[PDB]
Every structure is written in C-alpha cells, then in structure tokens.
C-alpha cells in the first residue's frame, strides 16, 4: 500500500549515513532518505542541506556508475 510522510525531520542527516533516496509527491511532497541501515527519514526537498545531499548523492552515484 501507499505510504506518505506526515512529518519532516528537523535534524540534518549526514550524506555519510544515507544509502539511497526517493521523492514521493503527495499533499506533503518530500525527500525520503534511507539510512545505510534501513531507516527512512523524510526531509524538506526545499531545504538547502537536503538539496546538497540529493546532489552529492547523484554526483556520487554517477561517477560510481560506469
């Protein structure tokens, strides 16, 4: 079934702890980070630190992609 974020984390998450991410878009669109051990934290897609991580990951999953 569908899962939506109700609350967004209020603490930044180190890129050095994220594994992957997605961007579900409901009434409360958000970036769902998946920590290296399985936790799923929602974050503001508008937050600078989030954007920074989303980029850092795309730029780290690109070079590490052929």
């Amino acid at each position: 079934d569908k899962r939506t974020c109700v609350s967004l984390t209020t603490q930044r998450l180190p890129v050095s702890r994220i594994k992957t991410y997605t961007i579900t878009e409901g009434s409360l669109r958000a970036v769902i980070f998946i920590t290296k051990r399985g936790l799923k934290v929602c974050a503001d897609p508008q937050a600078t630190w989030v954007r920074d991580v989303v980029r850092s990951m795309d730029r780290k999953s690109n070079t590490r992609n052929n």
Binding site: D1, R3, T4, V6, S7, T24
Partner: protein, 371 residues
C-alpha cells in the same frame, strides 16, 4: 455509591434560563457577581437543583472527613480526576462554578450550613470568598470564579472546610471545557475511618517512550502496519469494570511523532468502545489539541483547544454530535454495539489528548509524556 461516572445530554432549551446561565455563570464575562448571581437567584428559587442538569459528565469520588479539632474543622480534600489537560498560559480563563452542599437535616440544627472551598495550586491558591458567592440557600452555596485554564488540571487540589460533618456534604466544581461541554468534579464526604474511594478514572500516556516513534523502525514489532490497519488495541477497561469495554490504539503515536513514511489512510482509530447494546446514558469523547496554523517561529505559542462529542442511542442505533473545528469524530464500529473515535493521521501531530467518558468509566488518553 460515593463514587462513579455518569453522563446525560444537556439541552439548554429545557433549562430555566440556561441560555443565560451558560453565558453569565459558566463563561468568563462580567468580573462582578451581579449578573450571574441574578440569573441563579431567579432560577434556583424555583428549582433548587437546576444546575445539576448542566453537567454533561459527572465524576464523583468519596473522600473521608478529616478533622482539625483545634479549630473545630471538618475537612474534605481531593484530587479531582480532571478529564483533560487544562490548558496553556497563552490560553484565556475558564469560569468555574463551585458548589458546596449537603442533605437538608430533618430538625433545623442550631448551627447553620457553612463551607469554605479553595482550589489550591502550587504558586497561588484560588479561594472562593464572600466576594465570590453568586447564590446561597439553607444548605448550598454557589461560587463563581475565573481561573487561568492551565491551572485547572492535575496539581490543583480541591479543599472544602466545614465546621460540622453534615450528612451528604459534597463539593462540586462545574468545569466548562467548551461552550457546549461541562464536566463536574465532585467530592462526596465519607466516614473519617474510610479510605478515599476513587472513581474508575485513569490517565494513559499512549506515547510513553516518545523516542520510539521518531521513525518507523518498530512499526512491524509494535504491530502498527498496513496489515493490521494501524491498530494495536489494548484494554482500558479493567477486568471487573462496567460491561462496556474500552480500548485505545497506540499506533497514532507513530503518526504524531514519526518522520518516516507511514501507511496512507483516511482515518486512524484512536479508541473504540463495545457494549453499547446495553448502555443507557450517552457517551462523551473529548479531544485536546493545537491549531498550529498561522504560527510565528519567533513567538510560537499556540492555544490549546477542546471539543467534545456525544454519542447517543436512538432506536438501537448510536449517532454522533459534533463541534466545529473538532479533529475527531465518533462513528459506529463493526456493529451497533461498537463506536470508534476516528481522526485524520495528519491531525496527530497536534493532538494532545482524547478522553472517554461514559457510565462508570473515564479514560484520559494523552499523546505527550510518560506518566
């Protein structure tokens, strides 16, 4: 019985000037006893107990007489089981109506009826003085007073000092929680040699161990999944309790504190109640919450609101009544024998608590804390 919980509908239309009593005696209006004391003088002369019909819920407890011989005092003191968080400092006040009374003896005694009631908190101690009376009679006095809402909650001890152990002596604090819901806390006096007799009224911190719900880590284990329908029910009603079983749901805590994706659902069930088939009096459900809309981070202080719902039996079918901004609703469950308290998942972060009030049972569920 010296203790118990009871309910009743309250139609202000069928109440002597109730329309007025509500607005001038149970609402913080004129700062003088003039207005209210007028309305009650007129109405209580005809029917001495017209006030009893204003209590939607009445939670009474038996407290023993305590004597202070040196001063010849007969004292009864007790912790009223306030059904909900009183409020916040940023809130306004509530006009409460205190009432001391007792049976009218057969032979007129030599000493007349007198009672000093005080609602003492930590810092201050609100006293009901002569300047606070709004009505008197041979064996009953009624005091009016405005107390800041947050003062009216656990921590506020109710003490009434008498000079004689009048039979049937009792003190009642009529506490309006909303424009249409009034809870009456009652201390009924009992033998000095008797242990305090409390009503079946409990307080449950549904979300004890808040940290646990910061993420969906324990969802599977806690039993909160799409599979179970976000329902992990646990009994509120103790074993020998009334035939109406009440249950609470812990899962809402995830929807209130989690920053993890949770199953998308229209409503969560905060609690349910069976036994409606044999329940005669109504059922009240009160919610306490914040309206974080239009908040300023620099001065983020919101007011705590309260809405109370009522479920009643009509031709074997229970139906719900509602308040305006109420985040919760009552609807029939799996059968006519059950009712549930539904709320929207997105409302959980601002829901402070919900309380169940019905015959012989009162459960104050809170979503903050560990006690």
């Amino acid at each position: 019985h010296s203790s118990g919980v009871s309910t009743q509908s309250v139609d202000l239309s069928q109440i002597k000037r109730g329309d007025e009593i509500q607005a001038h005696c149970l609402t913080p209006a004129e700062t003088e006893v003039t207005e209210c004391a007028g309305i009650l003088k007129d109405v209580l002369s005809k029917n001495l107990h017209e006030l009893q019909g204003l209590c939607n819920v009445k939670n009474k407890m038996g407290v023993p007489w305590v004597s202070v011989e040196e001063l010849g005092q007969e004292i009864i003191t007790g912790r009223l089981p306030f059904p909900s968080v009183g409020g916040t400092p940023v809130n306004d006040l509530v006009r409460v109506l205190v009432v001391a009374e007792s049976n009218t003896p057969e032979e007129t005694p030599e000493e007349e009826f007198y009672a000093y009631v005080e609602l003492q908190t930590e810092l201050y101690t609100f006293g009901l003085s002569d300047d606070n009376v709004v009505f008197t009679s041979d064996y009953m006095t009624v005091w009016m007073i405005d107390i800041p809402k947050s003062y009216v909650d656990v921590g506020m001890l109710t003490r009434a000092t008498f000079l004689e152990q009048w039979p049937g002596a009792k003190v009642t604090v009529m506490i309006p929680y909303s424009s249409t819901f009034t809870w009456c806390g009652e201390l009924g006096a009992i033998s000095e040699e008797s242990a305090p007799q409390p009503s079946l009224s409990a307080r449950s911190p549904v979300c004890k161990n808040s940290a646990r719900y910061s993420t969906s880590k324990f969802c599977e284990v806690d039993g909160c999944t799409a599979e179970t329908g976000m329902e992990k029910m646990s009994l509120l009603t103790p074993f020998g309790g009334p035939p109406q079983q009440a249950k609470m749901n812990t899962c809402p805590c995830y929807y209130k504190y989690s920053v993890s994706p949770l199953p998308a659902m229209d409503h969560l069930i905060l609690a349910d109640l069976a036994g409606l088939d044999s329940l005669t009096s109504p059922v009240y459900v009160m919610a306490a919450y914040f309206d974080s809309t239009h908040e300023n981070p620099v001065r983020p202080s919101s007011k705590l609101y309260h809405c109370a719902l009522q479920m009643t039996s009509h031709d074997g079918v229970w139906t719900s009544t509602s308040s305006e901004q109420c985040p919760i609703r009552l609807v029939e469950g799996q059968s006519q024998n059950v009712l549930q308290v539904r709320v929207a998942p997105t409302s959980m972060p601002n829901l402070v608590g919900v309380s169940l009030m019905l015959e012989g049972q009162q459960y104050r569920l809170e979503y903050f804390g560990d006690h």
